[PDB]
């Protein structure tokens, strides 16, 4: 695509049935600088949803 | 201290004590029941 030159090797090419799995990066990316702590231990809470 | 056994909030107005707190309350009940036997009749099968 960059140069239009033929590729020296031939490429296995055709349609294939692919699936969209439920694991998205935007449902997993999490960062925490400072946030809520636990009442008992005063340590960072557990959970992406809980920060 | 209550730090070791803090209470918590379930739905915005309700609180249950930690296990250690209820255990200490049960111990206090037991203690007072002990102090209700050496003050009156106690036919030796309630003291034990």
């Amino acid at each position: 695509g960059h140069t239009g030159k033929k590729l020296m090797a031939q490429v296995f090419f055709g349609p294939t049935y692919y699936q969209r799995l439920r694991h998205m990066v935007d449902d997993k990316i999490h960062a925490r600088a400072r946030g809520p702590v636990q009442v008992l231990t005063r340590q960072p809470v557990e959970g992406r949803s809980r920060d | 201290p209550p730090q070791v056994r803090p209470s918590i909030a379930m739905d915005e107005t309700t609180q249950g004590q930690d296990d250690l707190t209820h255990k200490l309350s049960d111990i206090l009940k037991a203690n007072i029941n002990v102090q209700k036997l050496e003050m009156d009749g106690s036919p030796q099968h309630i003291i034990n």
Binding site: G1, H2, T3, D26, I29 | -
Partner: protein, 113 residues
């Protein structure tokens, strides 16, 4: 949520120049050009045009990262010639070739009717 905008490929900011020239001091009479907001389309055209001149000794380009829309080009020339003048010469030559190509395509299309 981290995806940049699809129009930053082509819209030039006001604080970002289109073109920036720095010299390569290691070899004589060589310059490094960074083209912002361009891609292989201009780069390959210019590279293969410049590579066929007698006075051009080195010419190359790369796109260091596909997620960023720029390329950098190294161009060296002989003692008398300046790489900048050769760059304008190549640009003008490709422009003239495209004009001739357009004229011939239009005449051919009219004849095909």
């Amino acid at each position: 949520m981290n995806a940049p905008d699809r129009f930053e490929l082509f819209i030039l900011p006001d604080d970002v120049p289109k073109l920036k020239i720095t010299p390569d001091s290691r070899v004589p009479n060589c310059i490094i050009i960074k083209f912002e907001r361009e891609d292989h389309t201009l780069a390959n055209l210019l590279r293969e045009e410049l590579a066929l001149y007698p006075d051009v000794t080195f010419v190359a380009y790369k796109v260091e990262h596909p997620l960023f829309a720029n390329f950098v080009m190294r161009l060296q020339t002989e003692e008398g010639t300046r790489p900048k003048q050769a760059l304008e010469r190549a640009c003008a030559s490709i422009i003239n070739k495209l004009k001739t190509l357009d004229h011939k395509f239009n005449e051919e299309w009219n004849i095909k009717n």
